[PDB]
Subunit: 596 residues, 3 copies
Amino acid sequence: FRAIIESPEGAGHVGYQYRRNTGSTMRMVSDVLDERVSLWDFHCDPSGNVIQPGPNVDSRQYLQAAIDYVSSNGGGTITIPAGYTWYLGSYGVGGIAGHSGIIQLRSNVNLNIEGRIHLSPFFDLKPFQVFVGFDNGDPASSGNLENCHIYGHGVVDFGGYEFGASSQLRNGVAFGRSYNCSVTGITFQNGDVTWAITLGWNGYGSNCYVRKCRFINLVNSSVNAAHSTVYVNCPYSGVESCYFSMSSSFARNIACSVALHQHDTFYRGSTVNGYCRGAYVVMHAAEAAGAGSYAYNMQVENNIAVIYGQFVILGSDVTATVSGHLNDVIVSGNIVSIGERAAFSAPFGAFIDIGPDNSGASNVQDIQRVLVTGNSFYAPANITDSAAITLRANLNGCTFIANNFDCRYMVYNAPGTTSPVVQNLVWDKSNVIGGTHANQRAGQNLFDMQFASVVNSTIEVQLSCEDLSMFSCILFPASCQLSYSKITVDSAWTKSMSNTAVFEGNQQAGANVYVSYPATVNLTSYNTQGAVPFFSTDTNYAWVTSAYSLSINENLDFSPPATYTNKANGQLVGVGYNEIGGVRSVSVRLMLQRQV
Amino acid sequence: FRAIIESPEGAGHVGYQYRRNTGSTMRMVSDVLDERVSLWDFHCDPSGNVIQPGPNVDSRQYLQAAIDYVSSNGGGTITIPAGYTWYLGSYGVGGIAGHSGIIQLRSNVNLNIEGRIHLSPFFDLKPFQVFVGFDNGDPASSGNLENCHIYGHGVVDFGGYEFGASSQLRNGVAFGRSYNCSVTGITFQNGDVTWAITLGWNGYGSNCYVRKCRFINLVNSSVNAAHSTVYVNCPYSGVESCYFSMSSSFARNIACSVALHQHDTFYRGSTVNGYCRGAYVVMHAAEAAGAGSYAYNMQVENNIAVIYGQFVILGSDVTATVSGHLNDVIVSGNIVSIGERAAFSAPFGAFIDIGPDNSGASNVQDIQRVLVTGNSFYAPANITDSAAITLRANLNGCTFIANNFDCRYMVYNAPGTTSPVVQNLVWDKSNVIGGTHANQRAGQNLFDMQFASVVNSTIEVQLSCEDLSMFSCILFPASCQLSYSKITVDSAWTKSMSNTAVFEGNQQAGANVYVSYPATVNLTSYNTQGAVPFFSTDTNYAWVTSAYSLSINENLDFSPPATYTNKANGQLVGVGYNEIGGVRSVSVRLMLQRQV
Amino acid sequence: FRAIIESPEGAGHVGYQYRRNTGSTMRMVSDVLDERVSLWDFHCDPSGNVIQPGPNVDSRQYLQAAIDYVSSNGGGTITIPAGYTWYLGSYGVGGIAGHSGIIQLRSNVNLNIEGRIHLSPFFDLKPFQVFVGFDNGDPASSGNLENCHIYGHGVVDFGGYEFGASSQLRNGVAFGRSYNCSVTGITFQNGDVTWAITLGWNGYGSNCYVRKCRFINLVNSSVNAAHSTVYVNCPYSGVESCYFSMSSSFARNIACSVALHQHDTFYRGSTVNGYCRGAYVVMHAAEAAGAGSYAYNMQVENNIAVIYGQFVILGSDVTATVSGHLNDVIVSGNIVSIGERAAFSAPFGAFIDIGPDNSGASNVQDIQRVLVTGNSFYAPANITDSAAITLRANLNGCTFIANNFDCRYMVYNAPGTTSPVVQNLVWDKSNVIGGTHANQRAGQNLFDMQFASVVNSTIEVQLSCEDLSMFSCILFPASCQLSYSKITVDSAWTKSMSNTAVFEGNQQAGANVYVSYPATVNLTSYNTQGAVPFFSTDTNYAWVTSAYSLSINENLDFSPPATYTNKANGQLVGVGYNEIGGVRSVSVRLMLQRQV
Ligand SMILES: CC(=O)N[C@@H]1[C@@H](O[C@H]2O[C@H](CO)[C@H](O[C@H]3O[C@H](CO[C@@H]4O[C@@H](C)[C@H](O)[C@@H](O)[C@H]4O)[C@@H](O)[C@H](O)[C@H]3O)[C@H](O[C@@H]3O[C@H](CO)[C@@H](O)[C@H](O)[C@H]3NC(C)=O)[C@H]2O)[C@H](O)[C@@H](CO[C@H]2O[C@H](CO)[C@@H](O)[C@H](O)[C@H]2O)O[C@@H]1O
Ligand SMILES: CC(=O)N[C@@H]1[C@@H](O[C@H]2O[C@H](CO)[C@H](O[C@H]3O[C@H](CO[C@@H]4O[C@@H](C)[C@H](O)[C@@H](O)[C@H]4O)[C@@H](O)[C@H](O)[C@H]3O)[C@H](O[C@@H]3O[C@H](CO)[C@@H](O)[C@H](O)[C@H]3NC(C)=O)[C@H]2O)[C@H](O)[C@@H](CO[C@H]2O[C@H](CO)[C@@H](O)[C@H](O)[C@H]2O)O[C@@H]1O
Ligand SMILES: CC(=O)N[C@@H]1[C@@H](O[C@H]2O[C@H](CO)[C@H](O[C@H]3O[C@H](CO[C@@H]4O[C@@H](C)[C@H](O)[C@@H](O)[C@H]4O)[C@@H](O)[C@H](O)[C@H]3O)[C@H](O[C@@H]3O[C@H](CO)[C@@H](O)[C@H](O)[C@H]3NC(C)=O)[C@H]2O)[C@H](O)[C@@H](CO[C@H]2O[C@H](CO)[C@@H](O)[C@H](O)[C@H]2O)O[C@@H]1O
Ligand code: NA
Ligand code: NA
Ligand code: NA
Ligand code: NA
Ligand code: NA
Ligand code: NA
Ligand code: NA
Ligand code: NA
Ligand code: NA
């Protein structure tokens, strides 16, 4: 009996009944203790003696034994205890070896990480994926991971080790073909990794989430090829209320916070600092196996960001046998800025980027039904490479309403690069254009329409302050076709502008182009006393349907017409009034209109 | 002593002091074990022997005993253990019997559901409410439920059983007259039920919430009369970050995700697929006892939905002695689509529906001060029955700003049905109208104003692409009165339209109607050389205050006026210019304006 | 052995192995029990006998001993047990004494509050701060608090005691110089306090959050000087999904829900009732030590509020050696109302307030790049003191897009008070002005521009119903300079208004002022048959660049011009048509335009 009690079965001989309640189960202490489980229950030598964790102990095999055992009972939650750091010092074996895996996750087995998990220097200059939910080296032959949650106040620390080679991959949690899996509360820090968390695999998975996590300093070297903190690769999944921070120079050029790569995915309520990019919103044809060829219902909302490159990047692409499509996207309520940097010192600053594929192709995309609304964007005045939208690949539609954009360009694409085919670009008059870059725009077009063609598009320019440095508010080169479009420039703050809208190929003459913009025009009247015609001296107004005065008349003896039409020879003409006769000659600011 | 130790009081004789700290309490093992409690502590036969759960064991009485006992000590949290399925196989007794209750919840007693709870086939074809917080068969004589939280990674499974009769009710959690109650984390699945969760009772309750829950496949038969997944019937309560999915055909016709039925309630950040409806936002007079006759401060924001009928349904109604009012509503940031379906195959597709009462009355409602802003809506091109708003009952105000609506109709109501009285309908120019339904609109009016009357309303139509199939952009039948309103049609993409705005009762002539829209007009001049008048051949322009040219002048020898007014006989008239004399006859596209 | 077993070391002699697994650690019961810790482990007399909590027991020393001990082991989570109320009855000692501290928090030591914590009457009429994370009386010499989380279903009750003197301070949780600290789930109630929670100290701290907490009735007396429920004084921190309620009259005059006082801070998804104010968004120079002199990336989104004063208050100020700046702010998606009250009975109602500093100075502020978008605001018709913006101090920019404001004023500042210098105030046409206050505006200007100067501003007024009671839609006194601005009044619902826009100093004549608004003008023609001029009888139109008819022509024999320009003497002039000759005299409603 003494022997039984001191034995490992002792607690199984000590009776217990909850709160002395006579209606409660007559149990043994061991039954109640068996209701919970921790790493300490597996962190022992072959004789069953507990092993203290530390920098010289590899905890991997013990944590794997705990997970495997709990898995065998239909699941539960293993605690990783507070007040200790648990080092990992070797790779795992079996199915996860193909993924450079350390720990293998299993279905229904949750991890409550309250202490710290820290990679030992065995992993320096090596690939690794700390937690892996695949059960096979080939993800295509992998089983699923279901009902696996990682949560707590603890920490995953990547030991500060740099990558050994750019081709290597490193990850924190790869859930795999993951259904109802989540990470909540955890801080991931101090590394050089590719991703912190990945959700799903090529569309297989569902209901995976990352909530209230922190990601701190996860890129640190020039070796690191690329980094996206959370890659969402299964539908009905997302990231909310997270914090992302980088301090490395390299992060400003390579790091993105989130990738939304399947339908019905979201990125909300998060704060980003020190990253190149905010989010990719993409349908890769190569990733279309699990959930189809369409990324739709994509939501980026209510985030706060300081970045160095582009906030949201839109794209879709193709393989030999699959074509990716991106549609039904909303980007709203975000407040974003380009951090303090030299012009051209990081990838081109943008709120929205329509990005060419990984091979640089701009003629594979199928991006449409995007709404960008109620966001703020700001870039410091020196950052020439800042745009509301860098439209660098084919676009089948994007709508901008009620944003506030305060940067160098509104619409931009580099000339002599790609020549995008643009459809259904809508820029509503309710987009407010800020003045931070006023006086910086010598030689530049606010809306620089460097495309192959534009159709079914609306650009309603409204200034809110003067910028007389700019070459034009909007310019179309002669190589850009323009049809079935509406282009207007409001006259406010434009009286002293030489050029307002510029159509280098006279594209505003098109049958279904509807335009209006201010221009200065010289007119000369006949000498007749009374009602008298005034005609423009130049003949380039054959496209104008009406025009009206934007200038006061300093004269007593006559007045020019208030309104004008045109004539077949391209003159404007209207009827004014000579109180006394005489040939008149005036220079007037007019609002030129065509079909509006 | 051996006997004491092996007895149920044994743990109460084994001393313990935390971490051997001499300043800590000298306790017994049983005291520490008594800090927590699980179902295992009550899941026992009359001799105190533990009973294993399973499909042949009814766990109800044991779980009730646990709840009752914990309640007696001022509360706590009972764990429903992971790795087991706990079947429920009988109804409860007492107060919850009137609600077909299984388990009775009690104040301060939380349930941490980590395992699975599953209904046994005793419940097939029967009503049931799994967890009930009422303590009396008559909710009016019920006490309150306070401080009751249900949370964890577990599951409530409704066993797949169909309803027996349409008149039956089924629910997961009925909190009752519920104050500071919540459900977090739980998956509700595999049923045919009326609701999964209900919060409050006829306005009694407060601070009830449903967060990070999943609701999967909860309608499965033609017997089911109706389904709303969460019914919010107490103020200061809401639903956030939930997932809702249905696969049944019947769900596309009967199921709604959320009902917000009292003031200061919200539905946010959620994803919906396979449902008929997104949310009801309603003040039922019959439900006004607990929190007054007004539903105000109602918020539907940042949701993602694929539905088959209507996204938000607005309503209010009356009883013999109470009148319901709905006001101060915001609908923002939502991205919604009608899923792939045949036209007319499910209830009429809509972003907003102003719905008649349960008896079909359209003259009881008092709905006003609604803001719909920054949402996206899409319906596939074949779905004739798709509208931004189906305005089917009296409306005292609704404001639309900066949305993107891509469907068949903008404003719709069926002719020869209800004749709503409309006030303060505001459709701002910043609403972008998509082109998916271009070419599908033969015989149809984009804004089909099938009302009794319209007052104090604004409709600013702006197209962003051509649709020459439509009969008109906006049409008022002669039975619709129109007064103190502004109606405009921007000219862009309208040059080839026969009809733009149509006023079948010539209602645009009204003293306080402010309109503008394009029209083609034939004019004929006098023969006089010089300044010469042009007059319209038709006499239907007595209401026009000015008009201006939207056409170029192909002539050298003359020009028509740029601008026109009218004359008492209903002609337009303006002054053009004959370089050489002669009677002129032209057909010109004009922008007709009245008081704008 | 019997003796050992009954001793405090007994559990350390009883063997245990998890679930009888031969691969598990051979432990003792005490090891498993040592995995968790509660207040009961420290709530004991000097002989180690447990003490029951209650109104006559001071639990403070015991809870401090628990925290100190857990801190010594590298942290963990102490449970404050459910089913008991734990009273605090004395002040703490050491570093927190300077802060009137009760309990001292320590790094990595979390509190899981499931029971109730309640202040005893020792604290009546006294200052107190219940939980304090500073370790020194002087916050400047304090160490940090890291990784401290307070969570659970429990309650902190302040005992209902009033303040003794207005100069006293009271707080719930002062995290101090706080990094990765949070409060989740807790209800704070029944007090008269200054704050419930404060985060950070003068910019020192990071990643502090308050989530899913309730704050109920925390002001109760006329003695209380001021109250803000959560004060956020460190960056990368915020408040989400909280509930705030007050019932006291005094709260309607003194209480604010949140203060956002450092960069990258947020307030989201919360509900407020009974408060004076929603949120301060402020950069105090005096608080600039820890995180710099700029508050930027400030976010107030998706809140629901009933308040009595101002929803968001913007400000910045200076000290002898530091200047505060506020920029890059977003206010979106909020639905707010002024609760039922008499006019002038609480501080002036406002959605946005640009507030002078604590000394009343209006010439210290540097507030710019603010976006206010997609919000709703409502005040009952009797509340004269209600404005979309009360602009009472210097403003360097604020942008309003796509809001719905239904109150007395749109833009307001009291005349004969402060004279703000205003730059970059942008009021887009997409702001919808409600009609609740129609007919209440005798003697009042909808936009009452009571400033020193206005520059680089846009005000686009659009009515949606008639209000003929108002004196004007917009008025500039002669003391307000106006330059490089755009001011328009849409004609809809304005035909019967005497005054639309009023420029008491004729400021619309300015070279870079762009305006348009309706006016009635009397004209007289020459007698000539045919094309004939009409001239205004008054000479105050020297600033007008064009005008056009907003009136029908009731005549057959002639028509006035459709469009007009001006003449140097300030007449308008245009060319109409006399079918028969004769001098004509008409009164016409025109749209007057200047440079637009
Ligand atoms: C770091 C990052 O996320 N970058 C984005 C680009 O992603 C792509 O490059 C990545 C570089 O790391 C990834 O490729 C790498 O990893 C692949 C997967 O690893 C294998 O399979 C795993 C399941 C195993 O555990 C591993 O052991 C290994 O076997 C590997 O095949 C590639 O060779 C390697 O370079 C990334 O690949 C994806 O990763 C996720 C997450 O782990 C996984 O779920 C997917 O299965 C996998 N996809 C594929 C196809 O294998 C790869 O996608 C990304 O392409 C780019 C988006 O922008 C560009 O394209 C847009 C659309 O055309 C265009 O709009 C834009 O302008 C372009 O810049 O963004 C980041 O750069
Ligand atoms: C399924 C659903 O939610 N449908 C919505 C309509 O709700 C209404 O019909 C429901 C059908 O199930 C409910 O009625 C049923 O249940 C009633 C309540 O059950 C009793 O009381 C419970 C507390 C007990 O536990 C039960 O044992 C039982 O005793 C019952 O009285 C009815 O006879 C039965 O048909 C629903 O009733 C409400 O349910 C909630 C949640 O449980 C409860 O808190 C309320 O007390 C209770 N209300 C009432 C009045 O009893 C009943 O409301 C809903 O009316 C409709 C809204 O849209 C229509 O009306 C709008 C406003 O005029 C209009 O804009 C719109 O166009 C219309 O379609 O939406 C769903 O159909
Ligand atoms: C109640 C509230 O929050 N009111 C807002 C104003 O805040 C300011 O007044 C408060 C009155 O309580 C605070 O001052 C009081 O407390 C100070 C701090 O206490 C000391 O230091 C603590 C760390 C210790 O634990 C204490 O023991 C004590 O030693 C004290 O120095 C003052 O004497 C006392 O009156 C508040 O002070 C701040 O509090 C936070 C939170 O605890 C702390 O992190 C800060 O260190 C501390 N700040 C300073 C400078 O010490 C003090 O800021 C607030 O000023 C006002 C904002 O609006 C006005 O100014 C705007 C900007 O110009 C302008 O736009 C607007 O129109 C103005 O009305 O809002 C509330 O009234
Ligand atoms: Na691999
Ligand atoms: Na769109
Ligand atoms: Na081209
Ligand atoms: Na009943
Ligand atoms: Na409204
Ligand atoms: Na009628
Ligand atoms: Na102090
Ligand atoms: Na702004
Ligand atoms: Na002045």
